[PDB]
Amino acid sequence: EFRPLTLPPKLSLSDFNEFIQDIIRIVGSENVEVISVDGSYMKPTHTHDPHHVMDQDYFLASAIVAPRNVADVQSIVGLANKFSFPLWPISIGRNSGYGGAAPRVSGSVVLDMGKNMNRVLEVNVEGAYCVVEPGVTYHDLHNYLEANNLRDKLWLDVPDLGGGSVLGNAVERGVGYTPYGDHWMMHSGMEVVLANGELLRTGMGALPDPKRPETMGLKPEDQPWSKIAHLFPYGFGPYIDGLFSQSNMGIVTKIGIWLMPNPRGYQSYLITLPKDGDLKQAVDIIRPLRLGMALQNVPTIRHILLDAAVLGDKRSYSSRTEPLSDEELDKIAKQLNLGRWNFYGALYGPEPIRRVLWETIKDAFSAIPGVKFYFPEDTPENSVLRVRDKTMQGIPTYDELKWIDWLPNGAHLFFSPIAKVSGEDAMMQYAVTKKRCQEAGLDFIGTFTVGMREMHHIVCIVFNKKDLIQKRKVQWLMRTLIDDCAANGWGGYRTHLAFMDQIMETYNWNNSSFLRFNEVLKNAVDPNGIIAPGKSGVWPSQYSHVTWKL
Amino acid sequence: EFRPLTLPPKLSLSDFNEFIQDIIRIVGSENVEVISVDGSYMKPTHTHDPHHVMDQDYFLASAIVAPRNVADVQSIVGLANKFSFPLWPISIGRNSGYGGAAPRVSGSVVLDMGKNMNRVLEVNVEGAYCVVEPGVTYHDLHNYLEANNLRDKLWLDVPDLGGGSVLGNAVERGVGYTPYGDHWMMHSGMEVVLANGELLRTGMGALPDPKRPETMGLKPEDQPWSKIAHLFPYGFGPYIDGLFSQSNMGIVTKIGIWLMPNPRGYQSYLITLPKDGDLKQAVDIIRPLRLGMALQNVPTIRHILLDAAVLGDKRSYSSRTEPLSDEELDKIAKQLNLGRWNFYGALYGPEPIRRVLWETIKDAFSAIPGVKFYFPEDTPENSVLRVRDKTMQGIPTYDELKWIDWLPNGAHLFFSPIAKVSGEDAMMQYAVTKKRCQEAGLDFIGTFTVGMREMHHIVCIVFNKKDLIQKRKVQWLMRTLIDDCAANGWGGYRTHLAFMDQIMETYNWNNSSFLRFNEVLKNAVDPNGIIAPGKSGVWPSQYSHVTWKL
Ligand SMILES: *Cc1cc2c(cc1C)nc1c(=O)[nH]c(=O)nc-1n2C[C@H](O)[C@H](O)[C@H](O)COP(=O)(O)OP(=O)(O)OC[C@H]1O[C@@H](n2cnc3c(N)ncnc32)[C@H](O)[C@@H]1O
Ligand SMILES: *Cc1cc2c(cc1C)nc1c(=O)[nH]c(=O)nc-1n2C[C@H](O)[C@H](O)[C@H](O)COP(=O)(O)OP(=O)(O)OC[C@H]1O[C@@H](n2cnc3c(N)ncnc32)[C@H](O)[C@@H]1O
């Protein structure tokens, strides 16, 4: 297909057309769409960033290809080398507010690993793990579980929504909410297609499965994995798996994820914190409850305007234009029966044990006047708790998609710095974010996700994507928070395409010794800069910093 | 000094003699020793392999060098890059049975990082971590904790002795036995002198500490870390930390290890399994208890002789010269009130929790005939339990050093296959290890140690170093052991100087993709291969494989 909307760098129109011809040849014209439209969460766009803060046709693909299998991805890559055509690998492209399936480099070949590469490849009950291809969602897998009666032997671990790729997410080092909440950490045995074309699997994945008659002459892609590939991550020698998450080192095609066995008892809960400044003493309570394994999962500390947005848009609470006042938020609390901060957690295992954690935790949160403890049953039926009951046992919902609609034309954008598990420090980060949010005229909407020693601060910027003034006011908001938080010793853990460069430029100890060392290894494995140039600030030698950096 | 027994390759006497003169002018004479003796554990040697299977002077330094600071380390890397001089950094060189201090490539400059770089830079009671330089033995840290009263707040995680470098062990991916027994996975934020000699700090350690007066003008080494540096492993971008374990990618100057807080209750236990065959059912029982979290640490399953040999050498049991027979093992067992296998574990936390777990466990092991339960107090003054009851609470000890003296000239080498947590697999490996020890006319000594989903199975080969026929026999054993276990889908997780190239060739999936990838990265980062060429089987392009491997 002839004249495209944006071409990749240095490439003539003639060369685009010969390139696509061989791709159309290899994949069949079903699995190639040249771009010469915004959609929804349910039929996700693979051309552009749906929750856009820049121009809509800023981060935009030139084509989209859907490899049917692993050798298609070798062919396509071997090809992209031949021309020097940037690629952008996506699994499901539901990386929304992080840019979705937009390419950082306008003119790229967004690579739809997900549309066809689809298989739940294995579920191992005694190993308590599973192998996933990029197309398997959280829901896909969940529906694999229930169709096989495995729901009663192994539980999953899920983000706020079920659309996401199991692997795409894990590679992004993302976060769920059971004891198995640290997604990346739960990986074992990765299969990666390298920039050069050569296939790789890491860990004991490199320890070959012993030869047998039934497996002879099977393509590397389709071979089985040795018995320990997915039980020990490290294998032998340097442990490279992590070079491949939040990186442009490769294209991931298979990934082992560990699964938590049915604990033998479950109960979720909600403790409500009446005042705004109850954050500080809360976190101070969570601190040695987390560190001492009285809090087994990854709990959340939701802000009121987060649940408020799930149960109904802004307009149905106030007709005001500025962000809502402190007294107005108080009303919304007593309205919905929530506090200013809500702490959502869950207990796991046999009744004898849940009993004691609960008595400890209740008993710990008693030094806060006005507190209140809820099990799911005790709430409204629309309730967030009633949904999150499901999220903390590995049952994927979509309910939470709604908070995106806090403002006319729904679009989000994340700022996720990292703070200490101290009440003091948590307050500080909230006061620094809150301040810059009013200056920008937004509301503050957020959650802290409690890791053992660290805390993920998710600043949920919603804006209406057809207000040309506010989208710039967000652009200014975003650039200031990164800076402000750096000035204060916090950095983001993940970002949107437009802010990769800054955020990485944030981590500049000893004159960017981290980036310079990364740039080194990139140029070594990808001599031609074709795998996802730009990702996480990391530019190859043939993308000039000046022309490219944002 | 003028004349060492061995020169590093392609290096002249006159060059060597400049390098040395040059080296001496930096670090003073007291800190530099040419070599023109096996030492102890109490004062480890730094030139060669103390428990040496190969020739006594097969792995040999040409000199030792102790930098008084990171700037020295830097200065040295500088010279070595000029002269193309192999380095071989050790922290403490206690790596016996993996080669102690000995350098993969003879003629290397052993960098004794520990002698002067020593300090415990930090114990952070909120963070439940600590920050350690290459010289901080376990024991050293232990005594530090004591002299600052922290013993009733933060506990350590020790491996079977106390000499070990807190960090040297960590970047070997070593293993101890509290619930924080996965040492490598407890690191957050490491510092590193790269091969080029540029200084790098990883993870959050890349986000610098914000400017204030009191730190202005400090050399990069002596700059503090930013707040989240040792609480969140990951930073932002591609996670490179792993690159620096069991690899030769950098020289490590500092590291942050998580410390586990006093858990508010502690009980250890011995479970004796009376039959050789009980291992099989025994592991099956472990599988669900491990994975459902009833077992909180790295319990281990020790072969009986282990305890035998801690208690008194081979002679003290029979003047027999060949391996002791099955029946003598039944004899010895009963003699010491032990089983044919031995399970050691611990209970952490309040009395109510301990209670419940310990019943779940008693009960589950009861299905094995003639099983018997002992607490510390229930056993004789000299017991292994009484020793491990210490080990399991982060207290360093050394009694276990005895087993090394099974034979006239004690020396141990290790073989370290990973294994499934399934009895049938476990027995398979036992069979195969055992048959082979039998054929080399050796006494089988092993443990498995219980990972979450895997088991580290440490075949403990011990032979007498002055016996050339035995030495040679042990070199046939290991090489056979690596091969057989590969042929049945089991890799070794860590090895000895003289088996590194072999073990790697074992992880050869898809025409060795793993090593080829790793050889690529290593040349990028170390053009003149001065850092530890050879480690883990990974070689620079100037070390021809034909010349160098084994
Ligand atoms: C708007 C939204 C997002 C969200 C969320 C709630 C809302 C309402 N809650 C989340 C949660 O609690 N936990 C979490 O981790 N993320 C949450 N999000 C963010 C996001 O939408 C989801 O996490 C989603 O699962 C991620 O998108 P997806 O799973 O569909 O993956 P992707 O679009 O392909 O993005 C991956 C990025 O990484 C690189 N990448 C991805 N896959 C590969 C493979 N196959 N090979 C090589 N590189 C890959 C890409 O460069 C891409 O940028
Ligand atoms: C014989 C013995 C050994 C032993 C054991 C019981 C007996 C009696 N029990 C162990 C166990 O419980 N768990 C475990 O992990 N190991 C056990 N061992 C083996 C050994 O004693 C320990 O592993 C010990 O901790 C290792 O010695 P050490 O800590 O001194 O390590 P090293 O000698 O200094 O060198 C080890 C390797 O590390 C790399 N290294 C070290 N420092 C650096 C720096 N800073 N920069 C870059 N690399 C570094 C080197 O490659 C070296 O090969």
Coordinates of N, CA, C and O in Angstrom, one line a residue, chain A residues 56-135:
Chain A
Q56 N -2.2 14.7 18.2 CA -2.8 13.4 18.0 C -1.9 12.6 17.0 O -1.8 11.3 17.2
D57 N -1.4 13.2 16.0 CA -0.6 12.6 14.9 C 0.9 12.8 15.2 O 1.7 12.7 14.3
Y58 N 1.2 13.1 16.4 CA 2.6 13.2 16.8 C 3.2 11.8 16.8 O 3.9 11.4 15.8
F59 N 3.1 11.0 17.9 CA 3.6 9.6 18.0 C 2.6 8.7 17.2 O 1.6 8.3 17.7
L60 N 3.1 8.4 16.0 CA 2.2 7.7 15.0 C 3.0 6.7 14.1 O 4.1 7.1 13.6
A61 N 2.5 5.5 14.0 CA 3.1 4.5 13.1 C 3.0 4.9 11.7 O 2.3 5.8 11.3
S62 N 3.8 4.1 10.9 CA 3.7 4.2 9.4 C 2.9 3.0 8.9 O 2.1 3.1 8.0
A63 N 3.1 1.8 9.5 CA 2.4 0.6 9.2 C 2.1 -0.1 10.5 O 2.3 0.5 11.6
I64 N 1.6 -1.3 10.5 CA 1.3 -2.1 11.6 C 1.4 -3.5 11.0 O 0.8 -3.8 10.0
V65 N 2.2 -4.4 11.7 CA 2.3 -5.7 11.2 C 1.9 -6.7 12.3 O 2.1 -6.4 13.4
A66 N 1.2 -7.8 11.9 CA 0.9 -8.8 12.9 C 1.5 -10.2 12.7 O 0.9 -11.1 12.1
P67 N 2.8 -10.4 13.1 CA 3.4 -11.7 12.9 C 2.5 -12.8 13.4 O 1.9 -12.7 14.4
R68 N 2.4 -13.9 12.6 CA 1.6 -15.0 12.9 C 2.3 -15.9 13.9 O 1.7 -16.5 14.7
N69 N 3.6 -16.0 13.8 CA 4.4 -16.8 14.6 C 5.8 -16.3 14.8 O 6.1 -15.2 14.3
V70 N 6.7 -17.0 15.5 CA 8.0 -16.6 15.9 C 9.0 -16.3 14.7 O 9.7 -15.4 14.7
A71 N 8.9 -17.2 13.6 CA 9.8 -17.0 12.5 C 9.4 -15.9 11.6 O 10.2 -15.4 10.8
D72 N 8.2 -15.4 11.7 CA 7.7 -14.2 11.1 C 8.4 -13.0 11.7 O 8.8 -12.0 11.0
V73 N 8.6 -13.0 13.0 CA 9.3 -12.0 13.7 C 10.8 -12.0 13.4 O 11.5 -10.9 13.4
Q74 N 11.4 -13.1 13.0 CA 12.8 -13.2 12.5 C 13.0 -12.6 11.2 O 13.9 -11.8 10.9
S75 N 12.0 -13.0 10.3 CA 11.9 -12.5 8.9 C 11.8 -11.0 8.9 O 12.6 -10.3 8.2
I76 N 10.8 -10.5 9.6 CA 10.5 -9.0 9.7 C 11.7 -8.2 10.2 O 12.1 -7.2 9.6
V77 N 12.3 -8.7 11.3 CA 13.6 -8.1 11.8 C 14.7 -8.2 10.9 O 15.3 -7.1 10.5
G78 N 15.1 -9.4 10.4 CA 16.1 -9.5 9.3 C 15.9 -8.5 8.2 O 16.8 -8.0 7.6
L79 N 14.6 -8.2 7.9 CA 14.2 -7.2 6.9 C 14.5 -5.8 7.4 O 15.1 -5.0 6.6
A80 N 14.0 -5.4 8.6 CA 14.1 -4.1 9.1 C 15.6 -3.7 9.2 O 15.9 -2.5 9.1
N81 N 16.5 -4.7 9.4 CA 17.9 -4.5 9.3 C 18.3 -4.1 7.9 O 19.0 -3.0 7.7
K82 N 17.9 -4.8 6.9 CA 18.2 -4.6 5.5 C 17.9 -3.2 5.0 O 18.6 -2.6 4.2
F83 N 16.8 -2.6 5.5 CA 16.5 -1.3 5.1 C 17.0 -0.3 6.2 O 17.5 0.7 5.8
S84 N 16.9 -0.8 7.4 CA 17.1 0.1 8.6 C 15.8 0.9 8.7 O 15.6 2.1 8.4
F85 N 14.8 0.1 9.2 CA 13.4 0.5 9.5 C 13.1 0.3 11.0 O 13.2 -0.8 11.4
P86 N 12.9 1.4 11.7 CA 12.6 1.2 13.1 C 11.4 0.4 13.3 O 10.4 0.5 12.6
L87 N 11.4 -0.4 14.3 CA 10.3 -1.2 14.8 C 9.8 -0.8 16.2 O 10.5 -0.2 16.9
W88 N 8.5 -1.1 16.5 CA 8.0 -0.9 17.8 C 7.1 -2.1 18.2 O 6.1 -2.3 17.7
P89 N 7.6 -2.8 19.2 CA 7.0 -4.1 19.5 C 5.9 -3.8 20.5 O 6.2 -3.1 21.5
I90 N 4.7 -4.3 20.2 CA 3.6 -4.2 21.2 C 3.0 -5.6 21.4 O 3.1 -6.4 20.5
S91 N 2.5 -5.9 22.5 CA 1.7 -7.1 22.8 C 0.2 -7.0 22.6 O -0.4 -7.7 21.8
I92 N -0.3 -6.0 23.3 CA -1.8 -5.8 23.2 C -2.0 -4.3 23.1 O -3.1 -3.9 22.6
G93 N -1.0 -3.5 23.4 CA -1.1 -2.1 23.1 C -2.1 -1.4 24.0 O -2.6 -0.3 23.6
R94 N -2.3 -1.9 25.2 CA -3.2 -1.2 26.1 C -2.5 -0.4 27.2 O -3.0 -0.1 28.2
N95 N -1.2 -0.2 26.9 CA -0.3 0.7 27.6 C -0.8 2.2 27.6 O -0.1 3.1 27.3
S96 N -2.1 2.4 28.0 CA -2.8 3.7 27.9 C -2.3 4.6 29.0 O -2.0 4.3 30.1
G97 N -2.2 5.9 28.6 CA -1.7 6.9 29.5 C -0.2 6.8 29.7 O 0.5 7.6 30.3
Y98 N 0.4 5.7 29.1 CA 1.8 5.5 29.0 C 2.1 5.6 27.5 O 3.3 5.6 27.1
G99 N 1.1 5.8 26.7 CA 1.2 6.1 25.3 C 0.5 5.0 24.4 O 0.4 5.2 23.2
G100 N 0.0 4.0 25.0 CA -0.5 2.8 24.3 C 0.5 2.4 23.3 O 1.7 2.2 23.6
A101 N 0.0 2.1 22.1 CA 0.8 1.5 21.0 C 1.5 2.5 20.1 O 1.9 2.1 19.0
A102 N 1.6 3.7 20.5 CA 2.3 4.7 19.7 C 3.8 4.4 19.7 O 4.3 3.9 20.7
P103 N 4.4 4.7 18.6 CA 5.9 4.6 18.5 C 6.5 5.9 18.9 O 6.0 7.0 18.5
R104 N 7.6 5.9 19.7 CA 8.3 7.0 20.1 C 8.9 7.8 18.9 O 9.0 9.0 18.9
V105 N 9.3 7.0 17.9 CA 9.8 7.5 16.6 C 8.7 7.5 15.5 O 8.5 6.4 14.9
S106 N 8.0 8.6 15.3 CA 7.1 8.6 14.2 C 7.7 8.0 12.9 O 8.8 8.3 12.5
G107 N 7.0 7.0 12.3 CA 7.4 6.4 11.1 C 7.7 5.0 11.2 O 8.2 4.4 10.2
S108 N 7.5 4.4 12.3 CA 7.9 3.1 12.7 C 6.9 2.0 12.3 O 5.8 2.3 11.9
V109 N 7.3 0.7 12.4 CA 6.4 -0.4 12.1 C 5.9 -1.1 13.4 O 6.3 -2.1 13.8
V110 N 4.9 -0.4 14.1 CA 4.3 -1.0 15.2 C 4.0 -2.5 14.9 O 3.5 -2.9 13.9
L111 N 4.5 -3.4 15.8 CA 4.6 -4.8 15.6 C 3.6 -5.5 16.5 O 3.8 -5.5 17.7
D112 N 2.5 -5.9 15.9 CA 1.4 -6.5 16.7 C 1.7 -8.0 17.1 O 1.2 -8.9 16.4
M113 N 2.5 -8.2 18.1 CA 2.8 -9.5 18.6 C 1.6 -10.2 19.1 O 1.5 -11.4 19.1
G114 N 0.6 -9.4 19.4 CA -0.6 -10.0 20.1 C -1.7 -10.6 19.3 O -2.3 -11.5 19.7
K115 N -1.9 -10.0 18.1 CA -3.2 -10.3 17.4 C -3.2 -11.8 17.1 O -4.3 -12.4 17.2
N116 N -2.1 -12.5 16.8 CA -2.1 -13.9 16.5 C -1.3 -14.8 17.4 O -1.7 -15.9 17.7
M117 N -0.2 -14.3 17.9 CA 0.6 -14.9 18.9 C -0.1 -14.8 20.2 O 0.0 -13.8 20.9
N118 N -0.7 -15.9 20.6 CA -1.9 -15.9 21.3 C -2.0 -17.0 22.4 O -2.9 -16.9 23.2
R119 N -1.1 -17.9 22.3 CA -1.4 -19.2 23.0 C -1.0 -19.1 24.5 O 0.0 -18.6 24.9
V120 N -1.9 -19.6 25.4 CA -1.5 -20.0 26.7 C -0.8 -21.3 26.5 O -1.4 -22.4 26.2
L121 N 0.5 -21.3 26.6 CA 1.4 -22.4 26.2 C 1.5 -23.5 27.2 O 1.7 -24.7 26.8
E122 N 1.4 -23.2 28.5 CA 1.5 -24.1 29.6 C 1.0 -23.6 30.9 O 1.2 -22.4 31.2
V123 N 0.5 -24.5 31.7 CA 0.1 -24.3 33.1 C 0.6 -25.5 33.8 O 0.2 -26.6 33.4
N124 N 1.5 -25.3 34.7 CA 2.2 -26.4 35.4 C 1.8 -26.4 36.9 O 2.2 -25.5 37.7
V125 N 0.9 -27.3 37.3 CA 0.3 -27.3 38.7 C 1.3 -27.5 39.8 O 1.2 -26.9 40.9
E126 N 2.2 -28.5 39.6 CA 3.2 -28.7 40.7 C 4.3 -27.8 40.7 O 4.9 -27.5 41.8
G127 N 4.6 -27.2 39.6 CA 5.6 -26.1 39.5 C 5.0 -24.8 39.9 O 5.7 -23.9 40.2
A128 N 3.6 -24.7 39.9 CA 2.9 -23.5 40.2 C 3.4 -22.3 39.4 O 3.9 -21.3 40.0
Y129 N 3.3 -22.4 38.1 CA 3.7 -21.3 37.2 C 2.9 -21.5 35.8 O 2.2 -22.4 35.7
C130 N 3.2 -20.6 34.9 CA 2.6 -20.7 33.5 C 3.4 -19.9 32.5 O 4.1 -19.0 32.8
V131 N 3.4 -20.4 31.2 CA 4.1 -19.8 30.1 C 3.2 -19.1 29.2 O 2.1 -19.6 28.7
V132 N 3.5 -17.8 28.8 CA 2.5 -17.0 28.1 C 3.2 -16.4 26.8 O 4.4 -16.1 26.8
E133 N 2.4 -16.3 25.7 CA 2.8 -15.5 24.5 C 2.2 -14.1 24.7 O 1.3 -13.9 25.5
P134 N 2.7 -13.1 23.9 CA 2.3 -11.8 24.1 C 0.8 -11.5 24.0 O 0.3 -10.6 24.6
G135 N 0.0 -12.3 23.2 CA -1.4 -12.0 23.0 C -2.4 -12.4 24.1 O -3.5 -12.0 24.1

